């Protein structure tokens, strides 16, 4: 999930926007 | 600010700025 | 910190601290 | 929603926890 993708690894805008409503 | 390791409040803060009026979900267990 | 007017990043920050490992949803349009 | 209850008005723990997963 977000932690694995953005905290444990380097985040991206593409991925961040998958969590916007 | 997005293209880095973002944890905890730092992550929450990036979601807030990127998502804007959409808001977001922060699911650290999922 | 909770029993006040909380807007924007301030609100997001309170949700983060209260909800902890649960995480949360921030739905400002809903 | 949360903005009306916690930003435009004074928030509460009770209400804040309704937005936890």
From Swiss-Prot, chains A, D:
Transmembrane segments: none annotated. The gene is INS. This is Insulin A chain. Disulfide bonds join 6-11. It comes from Bos taurus (Bovine).
């Amino acid at each position: 999930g977000i932690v694995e993708q953005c905290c444990t690894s380097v985040c991206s805008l593409y991925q961040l926007e998958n969590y916007c409503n | 600010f997005v293209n880095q390791h973002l944890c905890g409040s730092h992550l929450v803060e990036a979601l807030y700025l990127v998502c804007g009026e959409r808001g977001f979900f922060y699911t650290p267990k999922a």
